[PDB]
Amino acid sequence: ADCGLRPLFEKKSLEDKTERELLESYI
Amino acid sequence: IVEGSDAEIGMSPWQVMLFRKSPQELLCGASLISDRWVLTAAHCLLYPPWDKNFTENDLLVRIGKHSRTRYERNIEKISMLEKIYIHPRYNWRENLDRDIALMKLKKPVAFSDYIHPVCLPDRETAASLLQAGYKGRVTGWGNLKEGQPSVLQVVNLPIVERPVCKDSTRIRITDNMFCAGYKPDEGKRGDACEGDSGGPFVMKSPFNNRWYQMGIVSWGEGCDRDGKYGFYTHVFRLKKWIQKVIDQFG
Amino acid sequence: DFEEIPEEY
Ligand SMILES: N[C@@H](C(=O)N1CCC[C@H]1C(=O)NCc1cccc(Cl)c1)C(c1ccccc1)c1ccccc1
Ligand code: NA
Ligand code: NA
Numbered sequence: 001a002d003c004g005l006r007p008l009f010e011k012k013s014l015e016d017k018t019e020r021e022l023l024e025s026y027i
Numbered sequence: 028i029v030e031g032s033d034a035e036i037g038m039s040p041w042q043v044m045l046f047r048k049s050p051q052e053l054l055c056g057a058s059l060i061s062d063r064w065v066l067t068a069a070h071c072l073l074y075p076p077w078d079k080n081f082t083e084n085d086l087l088v089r090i091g092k093h094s095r096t097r098y099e100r101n102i103e104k105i106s107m108l109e110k111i112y113i114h115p116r117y118n119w120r121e122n123l124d125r126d127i128a129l130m131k132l133k134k135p136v137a138f139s140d141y142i143h144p145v146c147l148p149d150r151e152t153a154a155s156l157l158q159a160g161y162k163g164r165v166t167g168w169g170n171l172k173e174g175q176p177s178v179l180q181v182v183n184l185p186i187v188e189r190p191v192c193k194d195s196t197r198i199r200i201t202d203n204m205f206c207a208g209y210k211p212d213e214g215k216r217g218d219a220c221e222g223d224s225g226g227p228f229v230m231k232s233p234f235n236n237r238w239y240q241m242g243i244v245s246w247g248e249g250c251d252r253d254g255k256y257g258f259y260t261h262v263f264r265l266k267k268w269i270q271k272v273i274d275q276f277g
Numbered sequence: 278d279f280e281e282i283p284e285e286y
Contacts, residue, residue: 002143003237004145006238017035022164022183025160025162051282
C-alpha cells in the first residue's frame, strides 16, 4: 500500500540530491 | 560501493544490513519488502566454494541504519530470523543463476522515518523500466575499492544492453540477471563491491513516483573495472517464487 | 570496527 514512498522524501514532497539523474534517464 | 557518495538520512529506508553474530561483522546487504520479510542474495547465505552456509541462528538483521559500525541507538532496529528460504534452483556451482533468498523475521519491525519497505515490480513496471540506458540506484556498506565506509554509500548506474553484458565476460549469463554500470567511454564510473552483496538495485517509477527494487547485488569481476559491469538478480523474473514463498509461509 | 550491540539481541 505505501511501499516505495520514503517518509523523509516522497511523503514530504522533498527530493533527494540525485533522484533527478534517474528521472532524466527514463527517456 | 565504488565511486559512490554518502547516502542522505532516510534516503534508502528499506536498506537492511545482514550482520554476523560471532564474530560481529557485516555479512551482506539486503532489503525490507514488508514488516516481516527481508530480500537478499542467496550467495549471502549459501556459497559452498567459500565454505559459507549460514543458518537462522547465525544471523541478525539490522534495519534503519546509516553508520556502518556504530550502534544506532533509538534509530536502528535489530531483528532475529525465523526462517531462511533459498531459491530451489539457485546455481552456486556455475554462475549464481537465481541468486535470491528470503528471510522471515521472528517479530514484525516497526516502520519509522528511517525504516520503510521498498516495492517489488509488477510486469508492467519491469517492462517499462528495465531498458538499457535507464539508471537505477544501488546502496551498500561494502568496500570503497577493489577501505570500508563510515556510512551507507549510494551510486546511480545505467542498465547495460544484454549483448554488451555478455561480451564483457566469460561467465554464462542468464535471463535471470541484468548488468549495469558505465562503459569505459562514458567517463563516469562506479560499481558495487565486496560486502554490497544482497543489497538492492532500485528505480523510481515516473508513473507513480514510487521506488521499486528491480535487482539484487549479485556478482562482478573485481570492482569498477573498466569494460566490466555489475550483475544483478532480476527480481521480476523470480517474483512468482517470491510470492509463492510469502503466500505459503507468510 | 563494530560497536557492540545490546545483549538482548
Ligand atoms: N568475482 C565473482 C563474484 O562476483 N562472486 C563470487 C561469489 C560472490 C560474488 C561476489 O563477489 N559478489 C559481490 C559483487 C562484487 C562486485 C559487483 C557486484 Cl554487482 C557484486 C564472480 C567472477 C569470478 C571469476 C571471474 C569472473 C566473475 C563470480 C560470478 C558467478 C559465479 C562465481 C563467481
Ligand atoms: Na562472453
Ligand atoms: Na566497470
